[PDB]
Structures are given as C-alpha cells and as structure tokens.
Prior knowledge:
The structure is a homotetramer.
Chain A: H1 3-12, E1 18-19, H2 20-29, H3 40-52, E2 58-59, H4 61-68, H5 72-79, H6 88-103, E3 109-110, E4 126-131, E5 136-140, E6 146-147, H7 152-164, H8 166-172, H9 199-206, H10 215-229, E7 235-237, H11 239-248, H12 250-261, H13 271-281, E8 284-286, H14 288-299, H15 314-327, H16 333-339, E9 344-346, E10 351-356, E11 360-365, E12 368-369, H17 376-388
Antiparallel strand pairs in A: 1-2, 3-12, 4-5, 4-11, 6-8, 7-8, 9-10, 10-11
Bound molecules: ligand QA4 (2 copies).
Amino acid sequence: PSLEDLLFYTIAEGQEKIPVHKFITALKSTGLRTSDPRLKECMDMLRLTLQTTSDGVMLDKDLFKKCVQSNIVLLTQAFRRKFVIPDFMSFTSHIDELYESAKKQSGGKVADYIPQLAKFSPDLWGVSVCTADGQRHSTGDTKVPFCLQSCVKPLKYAIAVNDLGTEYVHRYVGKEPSGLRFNKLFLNEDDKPHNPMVNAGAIVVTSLIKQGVNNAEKFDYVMQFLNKMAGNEYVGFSNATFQSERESGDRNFAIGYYLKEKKCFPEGTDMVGILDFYFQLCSIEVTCESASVMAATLANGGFCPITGERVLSPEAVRNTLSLMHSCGMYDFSGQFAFHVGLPAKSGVAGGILLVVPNVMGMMCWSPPLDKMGNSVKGIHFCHDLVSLCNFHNYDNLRHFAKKLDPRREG
Amino acid sequence: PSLEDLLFYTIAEGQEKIPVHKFITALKSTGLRTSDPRLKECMDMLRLTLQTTSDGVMLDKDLFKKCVQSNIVLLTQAFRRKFVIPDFMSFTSHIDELYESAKKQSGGKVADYIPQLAKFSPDLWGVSVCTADGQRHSTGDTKVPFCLQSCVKPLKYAIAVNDLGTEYVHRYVGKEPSGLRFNKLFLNEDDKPHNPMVNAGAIVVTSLIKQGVNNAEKFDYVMQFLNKMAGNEYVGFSNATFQSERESGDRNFAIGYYLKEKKCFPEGTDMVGILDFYFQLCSIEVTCESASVMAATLANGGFCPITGERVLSPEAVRNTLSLMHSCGMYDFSGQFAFHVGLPAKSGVAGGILLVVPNVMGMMCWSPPLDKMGNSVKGIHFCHDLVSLCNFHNYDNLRHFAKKLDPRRE
Amino acid sequence: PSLEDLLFYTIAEGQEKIPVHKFITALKSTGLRTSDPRLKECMDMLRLTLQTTSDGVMLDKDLFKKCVQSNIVLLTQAFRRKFVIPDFMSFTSHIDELYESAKKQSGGKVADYIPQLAKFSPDLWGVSVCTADGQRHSTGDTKVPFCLQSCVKPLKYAIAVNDLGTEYVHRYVGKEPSGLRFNKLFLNEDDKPHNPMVNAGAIVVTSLIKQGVNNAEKFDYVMQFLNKMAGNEYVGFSNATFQSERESGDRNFAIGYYLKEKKCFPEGTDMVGILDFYFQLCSIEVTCESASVMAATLANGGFCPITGERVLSPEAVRNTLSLMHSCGMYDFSGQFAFHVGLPAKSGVAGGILLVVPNVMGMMCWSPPLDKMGNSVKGIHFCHDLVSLCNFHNYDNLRHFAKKLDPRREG
Amino acid sequence: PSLEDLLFYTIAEGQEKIPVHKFITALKSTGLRTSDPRLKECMDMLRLTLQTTSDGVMLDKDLFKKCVQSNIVLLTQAFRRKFVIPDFMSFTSHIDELYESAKKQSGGKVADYIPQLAKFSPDLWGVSVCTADGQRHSTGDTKVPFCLQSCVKPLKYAIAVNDLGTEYVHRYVGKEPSGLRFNKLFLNEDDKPHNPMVNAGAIVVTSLIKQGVNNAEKFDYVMQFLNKMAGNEYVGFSNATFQSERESGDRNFAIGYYLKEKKCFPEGTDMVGILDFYFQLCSIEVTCESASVMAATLANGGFCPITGERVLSPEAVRNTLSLMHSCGMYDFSGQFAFHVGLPAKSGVAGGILLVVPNVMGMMCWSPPLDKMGNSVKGIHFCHDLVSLCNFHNYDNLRHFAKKLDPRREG
Ligand SMILES: O=C(CC1CC1)Nc1nnc(OC2CCN(c3nnc(NC(=O)CC4CC4)s3)CC2)s1
Ligand SMILES: O=C(CC1CC1)Nc1nnc(OC2CCN(c3nnc(NC(=O)CC4CC4)s3)CC2)s1
C-alpha cells in the first residue's frame, strides 16, 4: 500500500490520469486554499510540471505522486473528509445565508469620535471563517482593512500571559467581569482593574509587555506576534487613526493618572509613554480574512491553523477565552454569554472577533454600532449562528433539537 | 454474522462457555453497574437462568444470547469501548487519587446556623461520578443523605424553563451575575433579581413552578421531576432542616417582602406560602450517588443517562449550565469560572453539584465550608480535577499541554 | 413705682378708665391669643368682673390691677414690645402675602397609595405660626386634621434622646444623610440605619421608646408627650390610616425583617409589634395650629412657648434640629438646606414642620406632593419665606442686604 | 453732652488727667489691638502728641478729645461693653484653657507625602480668634506661616459666587455632600462635582474665577481678594509647596482629565493650566492671626471686621457657610456637623478655619492629622469649644443648660 496512490485512485475515478484542475477543484472543495502555506511544496511542483511539460495537462499516478509527496498527510485528511467540518461546501452556504440575514439589519450609528472611523461607510459588512484545520470562506467586504481597536485587548493579554505567566499578569489585573453597574469604575476592591478587556485593564496589561525596551521595539514585538497568529496575512497599522486617538484620549489619560496614583503599573513604568503604546495597539489594522485566522489560532489551542507553528501557550489561550466569554462585549457580555455562549471580543471600528473553540475562528465587521458599542450586523449574525448550529458553549453534542451540527456528516 | 454472537466470543476467549461471574466482572469493568435500569431485562433473564439448575453457572452461545438479546446494543457499546471514557477503570483510579488528596484539606467551618447541619460531622467526604453514558464510580461517604440547599436552585430553574420557556421565566428574573459588589442587592436595574442562582432569584423562580396548584402538590411535582433526573435513585426530604429554615429565614422573609413590594412575583402569588415552598425545596435530601446522576442529566442534554428518558428540554439545560458558569459559587463564581471553567452549584450543607458537559456529572460533599460558603474539600477537588484533565470549558481538545484526556486511549 | 400701674398708664394714655375691649385688642395685636394658658388667670377675672359690675365696661387703675396682677410679667413683655417679633401685626401681613403667593402653585399629585390620603382635596392649604413667645397667626385651612406621617420621625427621635440620651440612641442609628443615591439602602457601613429620618431609622428609634411595656401604654406615653409639646392643643389619631398602613406596608415589613437579621434592634425586641407601633405613630393627627406649637417647642430649646412647660432636654432638641437640617426632606434635603437652610421635616400627607430656631415654629399643609414626596405649596412657601427674611441658618443678623428682619424694629 | 468726654470721665476716674498707658491698657482690655486699622487716626494722633511732651505723659480732657475725636463711635462701644462679647477678658481665659487641654492630645501623623509639610514640627499648635467686632486674641504659634491647602477651597468658592452669582457658579458644581460611601467619585449624577469643597469641585470652581485672563493675573486677583478679607495681615506664598504639589498631584491630574472628558469646565478652559492655578491656590500661606480674620469676614456677612470694608456679597457668604457646614471636614463632615454644629474647613497642613456666625471667626493650626485628614488638636479644640459655649448652630439662645454664653454679661 502507498498513501499517495490510494489518494490517486480516490480522485482518479477508476480512470487512468487526473486533470490538474479536477484536482484543484477537488482540493478547494475541502475549504483549503491553494495559497495555503502548508501546501506550498505541492503547489510549487504543480506549477513546475505545468512548465516542464506543457504537453498534457494530466497526471500519471507517479507525477501526482511527485507533487503530493511533500504534503501528503495533510492532503489525505482533506480528501478523506477528516477535517473538523467534513462537508465544508454546505457549511459555507449556511454562512452565506446567515450573512444575508444580517445584511438587512441596517441600524446603528458609526463611531464618530475621530474623522478616521467616521470615514467608514455603513454598508460595509463582511464575515470570514477559518477553521481549526485551515478551511476558509469569506462573503462580503472581507478584504477591507480596519483597526482592531478593542479587538486587540485579548490578543495582547494572550501575549502577556504567554510571556509572563498567569500569576504575574493577574497580580496586576483582575479576572472577573465588573458587573453591569460598574462600567464607570476603573479599579475593583483590591485596587486592580476588573479584567483585561476593560480600558483600564488593557492599559495595565499594555504596561507589562516587553518591559525595559523602547516603544518602537515593543510595537514590533507585538506585530511579529500578531503576524504569526494570522499566518502572515495582513496585519497593518494606520498612523491616521493613531494621531487622532492621541488627541482624544482624555478618558484614557484620566485612567492613566488614576492608575499611577494607585500604583497599579509595574515599578519603573513611564505611564504617559505606555498610553502612546496603547494608542498605537488600537490602530493596528486587519482585514476580516487576516483576523479570522487569528481567532482560529485561539480556537486551535494556540497553533496557527494555516502554518502549524505554535504561537501561544495553552495557558494563554485558555485564559483569554475565559475572559472573552464574560467580559468581551462591553455591557452586552452578560446577555451575549447567555444567548450566544461564544468567546468574542467587539471593537468600535465595527469588528467582532469570534471563537468557536475546537472548531473555527471568525471576524465580522460592520462599522455601525448599537448603543452599547457593538457592530449591529455582527451581533445579529452571532445570534443567527448559534440559533442554527450547536456551537453554544452549552449546547449538547448528542441531543440538540433541530440545531444543525456541522461536525457531522449524515 | 450475528452481533449477539460476535460479543459472545469477545468475552468467551474462544473458550467453552462464559461463567456468569466472569461476564458481570467484565460488565462492571466498563463502569456500568448491574443495577442499571437499561439492563433490567438482561438482569431479569440472568436471574431466570440462575434458577434453571444451580451449578454449572456457564452460558452457551445461545443462553448468553438469551439474556443479552434485549440490551445488546448497549452491551456492545460498553464492550467495544465506545463509552465517553473508554478506559474507565483507569479514570476512576485518578478519581481516587484526587479524592484522597482532597481528603487532607481539613480546614473550614460547618454551617452551624441550623442545628441540623451543625450535627453533621466535618470528616464526611464523598465523591460520585456519573458519565453521560451511565458509567459510575464513588469514593467516600457517597450513600449518606444530605440537603441540597442551594444546589437545588439550578434544578428548579431547569424545571421552570422546561415547562414555561426562556422568555416567560426571564420576565421575572435576570440572567447575568451580580458583580462582586452585589451579593448584597436583591434587584438589578430592571427591578428583577440578578439571576436564578441568588436567593432573591431562586425565590422568584419558586413562584413560577406549577402555579395555581397548592404547595403540597407543587412539592410532589418537583419531587417527581427530581426523581426523573436521578434515575429514581435517592431523593428525600428532612422535615428537621425544613423546620429550622422556617424559624430562621428572617433574611428570606426580608427578601420576600422586598419582592412583594416591588411586584416581582406573578400575579396571584401568596408570597408567604412561596417562602414555605422555598424552604421545603432546600431541605430536599440527596446522596452523592443520586445527585451525581442529576448532574449527568444536565451533562447529557436533558436525557437521564441511566434510564434514557428525556427529562429536560435542551433550552432548559443550556440555560442552567450557562448560569451555573457565572453565578454558581457565591462570591467565588468569578475565580471559579476562570480557574475551573465548569458549571457547578454549591450549597451550605457542603454540596457541590458539578457538570462536565458531554462527559459526566458529579456531586461532591463535605460539610466544612470556606469563608465564602463553598465546601473546602469540594473546591480543592475541582481545581485538582481540571488541573489533571482537559475538562476546562476552554481547554483545547487537540493541543492540551501535559493534561490527560480521559476520552482517549 | 408700681409693676401693674405704669403698665396701666402705658395702655391708658393719660385717661381715667380703659374700655375692656380696648384692652383686649391691644393684647391681641401683640399676637397673643386670649385663650393663652399663661393668660387664663387674667381672662377668668376679666369676665368675672364683666358679671360683677356688668354695667360699665371700663377699668379704674385698681380694677385693671385686679385682673393683670396674676399675669403681669407676661403682659408687660407683650406691651413693651419685648417679644421676639415686636411688630407682629406687620409680620402677619407678610405671611398672608406669602400664603397667597403659594396658593397659586397648583401643581403636584396627592398621595393616593391609601384611600385615606387620597380622601384629601388638593386645594387645602394652611399655614400656622407660633413664636418662641406664644404669638400666633394662621391663614388658610389651619383647623383641618391630617396625619403627621413622617413628620413624627423627628418628634419620636427627640423623645428617645430625651429619655435615653444621645450616646445610647446613636448606638442603634446613624447621624448623617445617606448621600443622594443611598435611598434604597437600609444600613450604612456599621450596619446601622443612616439616620433617624429614614424609614429604617425611624423604625429602630421606635424600638427604643419605653422598652418592656405593651403597645397601648407605649402609645399613651408618646401621646402624653406630644400633648405637652403642643400645649394640649389638638393631637389625635386616625384609626382609618392605621389600618391601611398596616395592610400595605410591605416595604416597612421588608425593612423590619432586614433589621432583625442584621441585629439592629435592642435585645428582646418584638419586631412585628414594633412595626405595628410605628404604623400607629404615623397615623397620629394634628392640625396646622396644634403642630405649629410643637415646632415652636423645638424652636424654643424644649420649652413649650404657650405653657412654659419644659418638655424636651436641650440635648434632645439640638440633636433633632441638626438632623432635620440635613435629612428632613427626603431627596430634597441637600437642596432644601442649601436654599432654605431651616430645620424642617416633611410628610406624605402634605405637611412640612418648620423651625426657625430662637424665633418660631410653623406647619404648612397642602396634600399635593411633588415627585420627591414634599408638598408643592409647602416647599414654595419656604423658599419665599427665607428670600424675604434673614431666617436662613447662615444669613447674617447684622449685614443682610435687602432681606427683612422681623426681630428688629425700624 | 459730648460723647468724647462722656468717655473721658469713664476712663478718667473722676480724676485729673488720664495717663496714656492707662488708656491703651484700658483699650487692649477691650480686645481691640492698638494696630486696629479703624484706630489709625487715633493712634497717629497719639503718636503725634506723644512727640510734643516728654513731660506730662497725661491727657487733658481736651487732648484726649483731640485724639479720640475721629474714632469716637468705635471707641465708645468698646468701653460701653457693646461688643459681641462684652466680657472679652474672661472669654480669652477660657480660650486659654481650651488651648491647654488640646495641647495634651499628642496623637496623629504629620502629612508626609511632600517634604514641605513633612519638615513641620508635630508640636506646633496655635489658636486665633477674631470677633465680628474686631476683638482679637491668640495663644500658641499664631504668627508661623503655613499653607492653606484645602482651607482655600471655601475662600475661592466665595470669590466665585461673589463675582458671578450662585446660579451661574452652580451650573458647574453641585451643592450637597456626596455621602460617606462616595468620597471616591468625582462627579454626581448630573455630571457635576458634588460640591465646591471636594477636590473635583474646587478644580471646577477654579476654572470659573476671572476667566479669560492669564494665570499670573488670576493669581494676583485672588491674592488681593484675600488681602481684603484679612484686613491686610499676613498672606503669602510658598513656592516650595507649589513645586512639590505639581510633581505629585497625580490624582489631581486624573481628576482634571476626567472633568475635561465629561465636559465639566466652561468652554475655552485650558485644563492643565487650571490645575497649575489650583496648585498655586493651595500653596498660599497664612498665619493663625491673619487667617482668623478671613474667618471673621465670613462670620460678619462679608464685612472684614477690622477694616469695615465689604469684601463678599451676603449671597456669597451664606452659600460658603452652608457648604462648610456639610462638606468641610472630609469624611468627618457629618459627625462634625452633628457634634460641633459650626461651619469649618480643614486642610492637610493642619489648619482648621472655623466660623461661629454672628460672633467670631477662628483659625486653629497643629500639623498632626488624624486618620481622616483633620488636625487632631484642632478637632479636639472645637469639640471642647462647643461643649463649653452655646455656639452650636442649633443651641437655644434662651435655654441652653449649663453651657456658658459669651454674648451675655451676668
Ligand atoms: O458615575 C458617577 C455618578 C454616580 C451616580 C452617582 N460618578 C463618578 N465619578 N467618577 C467616576 O470615575 C471613577 C474614577 C475612579 N474611581 C474608582 N473606581 N474604582 C474604585 N475602587 C473601588 O470600588 C474599591 C472598593 C471600595 C473598596 S474607585 C471612582 C470613579 S464615576
Ligand atoms: O434598586 C436597586 C438598583 C441598583 C442597580 C442595582 N438595587 C437594590 N436591590 N435591593 C435593594 O434593597 C436593599 C434593601 C436592604 N439591603 C441593604 N441595605 N444596605 C446595604 N448596604 C450595607 O448595609 C453596607 C454598605 C456600606 C453601606 S444592603 C439590601 C438591598 S436596592
């Protein structure tokens, strides 16, 4: 027996040679993209033979073997329906329907704080999916860049814990939700911020990352991190939104001084510089596609699913998912934890970073916010999603009424 | 082919016949108990053949099939190691280690506010396990009855939602945690109690179950329900602790009158009777074994794992696990959700009802409480549990460090 | 020289005999009423001589001497303008204009939570004055009975301190205002009610009065007290209001059980009987005239100005005035102390018991309440009052701009 | 008749000539000081004639009148025991006892957050009195300069209301005390600081004074203003304390940014300049004598009692006295109002500015503070003060137990 040849006959159809396009559409049907970094060696040798013998273009059994040799094990699971979502083609059409149901909920008002988010038009709406296995799909405005804003708070919290450990980080910031009556308080009762997802907590967390180095190298350190989470897809930076966040963070300056007075930063902290670093981190840009890979990195125990390098310790992604659960959506986190039951983080540019643990990561983006600060279309999508699939943290995997389970076949 | 006969040879070893003791010892190894309700027809026909002629306790291929015919699909799933924890005999050996390691944490104070918990000894400590498949194990004082107290709060919430639906119930009670600055408040901004796990909420939820019937029959109804959840294992009642809660619930009466004044009960409520009903509900008795089965009913989407009966609507069970997550351990719910990440509910008798969704249900019980109200041994156990296995709600099932996963071989 | 005799000539005006009616109106102009208990001896012998020498209504120098001999010292202070308000006749016309200006403020809603307060018409409006010297004036519906409701809280607090002293009472009850959103909280940090003027505080105080006796004599003990404070004018009791307040005091019972749980009562307290007693004290009736004298005993260091009876210790009256200043008018107490700056207590029947220390007491009554619980016309009257006179707690008695000073002459 | 020598024989003894020393000693007996500004012309005229004659240090009836002619009306009330305290010489002997009893209370901690208050000795302790009539007395370290710190809070609030009126000023700051459970919050429910006596309130009040001019002229405006209030006694400035207050007022900047974000300042405010000005205002220096005169301007309806100048509108003095009543002693304000019943304001240098309305003003100073921020010796002194005399705001002027009344003679 030989794994490359058994997969040959699977696609061969009892026939004698396989056209390459028939192989290519067979592959994309799995949800894989031909640009997948785990597939480069296979694709590089297909493009080569598609030069060496323009003659063709059909593959013997032993040239198919020459190309899939390198990435055979990943290819077999794709064609033997072993990915976490086996029928990826039907799942994506569900996403498409869920997308179009959100697309009609046209309320909310775009963030007006700076001329840079006000710049964004309300009809932009994109969702993109990345599974824990690398299967992708997008629909809508998924290649438009936008800033993470408070979508970055879980990403840097993971880095802090990854680099420093739970006990250190949570010596400086709590691990509970405020309570719907304390969106106004900076500190909890032990004089630490309530959790990493609130502005005072995010700021203290920023104060821990890569201490003793200057603000340029801290920034590069975090972005090399954010690149690994996204498999080197688009991670950018808008100086435009940074400058205006610099002139309008009166409240953040209020928090900054309060924290200095109550000695909540590590010793030797330059608080006014830390705020600048914090302002920068909120102006990091992503698209819906690149961020969906980040979310899937958290969904995948810290391994970036399209590259397979370990980016975060399991201790960091577990901690981050727990605090996204309960403190991820501003005042909506209680209701969101109840009705949707997914770790998510929302941001004021209209982004909602969504994680379905052990399944997939997502990014939804629509600039118009509701009155609690969350993307209107995004929130509508996430209710529609859990109402359709048994992804709620406390759905049952065995008995789930008329919910669909995409992890199953028939 | 013949699957009753296929299983005969699995246990028979290609040898003559199966001694019956060798069959049941194989059976207990799976984690099933011979008293399993789904096995009665098999056991009934074992009791029949053991009267045929008392020695030569051996089963041919056709008398073995004579007994296992009725329950063959469940028996093969056990013997083809298809249960949620395949190597169950090894998992229980870890339970034993976790239990006996927790046994050494002898700090805490027994609740003394009533003489009925004050008579309970601090050295009692029991742990019982029930999988989503009916595999059982216990260690310690697992057959001693004790009151649920506020471990009953999620159970009646489930009943309420099961019978009346999310939207009605949550017209009368919120669905978020108070906030560690609010175990002192009864009502949130909308003048409803914060969630079903706090006393004002539980009291309101109690006012929803089986309205229009009197308190005797409401109680009979809830007992019938808890019987379904526990597979007809021990559910009782101690009139003693009921009396003392009745003479000692000044705080409960304070809450009741606040709720009556701010009109949080359904119309036609006899508020002072509902308090009486509530006191009864907290004096319902369970053992660790019986209650662990109730926990497993929640772990299993509302189906009782030792009977197969559908006991709760999926909407009821999801909701309850959701609110056990964030509001289940008094002031410890935040720290508990973060470190343990399992839906749990604690009570002042020393109980902790624990759910590991899609795996198993649990009940731990040792009366000495910590200064937040949670059983000291219990809390130590659930930390040790999640630290050993990847049962944390936000562990990864694929990449989980040096944690052990009992669902795998 | 001669005590009665020059006082004869002061009123005689060089004449031989004084018409008796001319004596009576001269006396009434001082503000004294001829029914004053400190004047009974003089009046008894005035009508007696109007029988014994029934023909000829005039008094020589020695028959005037026959009648005023008993009350001469009080009589001279009245006629030598030595009373706290010398020109009482001009002060009253101001009261009347102030009354007529409030009579136009026709907004508000009458308390309807029980049918007995709903019984009262919105157009009733009464004001009565009693100085620290016994001068009286009324205008409007000043002889209509109504319940004190929370106007009784300062009065029973005084009895408690009078009988037990500051230090004991304030073991069980605070002495500060809540803070304008701690009105739903029953207890402060030390697990005592915030002050005696909140319902929880009043209830605890009720628990200290005459401990160890049954409710009938406790009630008679308190009422025996109030009669003295009012110089034995109308103090009554509405059984109707008592029944309906007990029927419907769910929140009060809520408070009662809460206080028992947090052990706020003295040992051996029967909590539900104390509640019954509290409801009774809230259904005690006064008219504007009878209560205005009670207010004056507080204005007068504890001496009832129309009888000379010492009714309350100076420690009791100081404490009670202190807490009416800051906590007496529900959520309006801060605004009321700022703008009016007088010790006052409001009640849900529409009464406002007002004290001008060292000057006078008043009670205003109009059933319509505003949305904080205070009589609309009542509150309007007290603003008008202090804008007119230097009665504000911190006006200056020497430099006071264009305010009028009734304690002074011309 | 001639009221110049009606007074001559009063001091003369039926005698001959009056020695000059006997006259001024008779004068200091009144409590007036020979340095009284209202006595300049008289003192200048004593200084002139005590040049002419080294022989005959004595005053005929015609040269006494030559000197006292101009200030005769003030001198007559002094010798005619018409001052607010007729027997001032005994009242100061009580002040001495009250001082010596406080001298024994050696607890507390000198404020150490800045080295400028930290080098102050713990045994410095001074008390100074100034009546509404200009009578003066001091005991202890009454000429040692120290900073007002938060004792300046009422003074600038007075200026603010004096220049713009109550209604404008209170658009930017409330008028009630927070409540002993909200000393941590910056803003009330209407998004204004709770009152002028808390740091958020003072900062906003600072933003209203003499708007539109630069900080140099703003400071000069307030400095003369305080000059008028103190009758031109010592008012200074410690640049040392100002410097240490700006490098360590982390909480103050936090407050400023919060107020800036929630738009609590009038439009056109340079928030960080207002903080600079505020720090300056807290580093104004006084002595006990000079500050007690400021207290006396507040006791006197806005007239400085040693110069006769009108410095504050009565509306300004009422308002400030009202808010010193309830918010003047930090978390001790409720207990202080209940037990002492006088408007006072404390500051962290150990000062307590105390007002007994219509009687006298005071400044007490001992740097050791208690655990709430008030001078230990200071607080002990004012308790002892009011238990001795009927100065409590709700004492009775007629029935006041065995308390002493310094306003009466026998
Ligand atoms: O909203 C309001 C109106 C509200 C309706 C009456 N006022 C506001 N004024 N300022 C605001 O901003 C923050 C600034 C930082 N700050 C703290 N946050 N956390 C703290 N510590 C604890 O709670 C520890 C417990 C005690 C042991 S103190 C105080 C408030 S809100
Ligand atoms: O209305 C609301 C809206 C708000 C948005 C959530 N919540 C409410 N929920 N229940 C209420 O009633 C009170 C009745 C008496 N009771 C207390 N009184 N005082 C207390 N605090 C202390 O004693 C100590 C602290 C230091 C002072 S707790 C408990 C609850 S209010």
